[PDB]
Design a protein around this ligand. Structure first.
Ligand SMILES: [Cu+2]
Ligand SMILES: [Cu+2]
Ligand code: NA
Ligand code: NI
Length: 310
């Protein structure tokens, strides 16, 4: 999509709403699978709500797009290679765009709280470019996301419950290495309405469940090699004080000469389930994390679908 120029990135939509265009500053790559990142400081310092997203991606070149909220983007630069990292602090993912999988809208009345004393101060946009053949004419690129914000407080607040492995070790050649993650949920009810899975090249399947009175309700189950959008939850899932959240990524060691651990680089691995929820405004918190596996013996009664690939 076109570069803005003289009109700037902020469009007022009315007295209390405005659209913010986060775009690449006319960038040109040189190699394939290049990863680019930029930051936008929120224009308002007071609290606001991300109520909508609109992708502005040149359909030829872009593989996927990710947008985060954080307070300390990795580079105080115009743009940068995301191998240097996205944020110094916790990067809160808000929006994922996939080529072969068109995203879903936020439910009306649900919004991410940003800015203010506690909300994110910056957005970080990440654009993964696939094929770089589109630069034979040599145009610059301004692909990115147009985000809808409002000062109007939303009755429901969007949030992110991130489940992720930290201690996994994938022995070389090994056929099946499971990565389990489990936490007991101790907040006010949330309603999970979407999930995204993340793995590197060795993941076979990733699936998260709710365990309430020792019974596994499925949140999401996905092949991590399939374009990593936020897919919507079939039937929306409440999670309540007492419930336990459980995720397993399934990995293979085949075609690897040396053991693989959890890490940044592509020759490393990751086991991330991004459970995306909403809560009642007055009870909501914006981000939760599980990096533990507190109920490991519980994983014996896991459904057998979680072990076969989709
Ligand atoms: Cu991609
Ligand atoms: Cu990764
Ligand atoms: Na990264
Ligand atoms: Ni409910």
């Amino acid at each position: 999509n076109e570069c803005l120029g003289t009109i700037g990135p902020v469009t007022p939509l009315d007295a209390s709403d405005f659209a913010l265009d986060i775009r690449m500053p006319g960038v040109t790559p040189k190699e394939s699978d290049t990863y680019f990142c930029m930051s936008m400081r929120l224009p308002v310092d007071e609290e606001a709500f991300v109520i909508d997203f609109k992708p502005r991606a040149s359909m030829d070149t872009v593989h996927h797009m990710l947008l985060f909220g954080c307070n300390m983007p990795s580079s105080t630069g115009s743009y940068w290679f995301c191998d240097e990292g996205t944020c110094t602090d916790k990067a809160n993912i808000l929006y994922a765009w996939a080529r072969n999988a068109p995203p879903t809208r936020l439910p009306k009345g649900v919004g991410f709280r940003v800015g203010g004393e506690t909300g994110s101060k910056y957005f970080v946009l990440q654009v993964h470019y696939g094929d770089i053949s589109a630069f034979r004419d040599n145009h610059k690129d301004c692909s990115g996301v147009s985000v809808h914000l409002t000062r109007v407080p939303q009755p429901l607040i969007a949030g992110m419950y991130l489940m992720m492995s930290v201690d996994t070790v994938i022995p070389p050649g090994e056929k099946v290495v499971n990565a389990d993650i489990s936490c007991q949920y101790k907040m006010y009810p949330m309603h999970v309405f979407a999930y995204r899975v993340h793995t590197h090249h060795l993941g076979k399947v990733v699936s998260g469940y709710r365990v309430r009175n020792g019974q596994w309700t499925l949140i999401g189950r996905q092949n991590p090699q399939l374009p990593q959008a936020f897919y919507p939850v079939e039937h929306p899932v409440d999670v309540t004080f007492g419930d336990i959240l459980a995720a397993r990524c399934v990995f293979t060691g085949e075609g690897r000469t040396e053991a693989t651990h959890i890490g940044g680089t592509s020759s490393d691995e990751m086991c991330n389930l991004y459970i995306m929820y909403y809560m009642e405004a007055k009870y909501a918190l914006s981000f939760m994390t599980c990096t533990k596996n507190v109920a490991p013996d519980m994983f014996r009664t896991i459904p057998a679908e979680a072990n076969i690939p989709i």
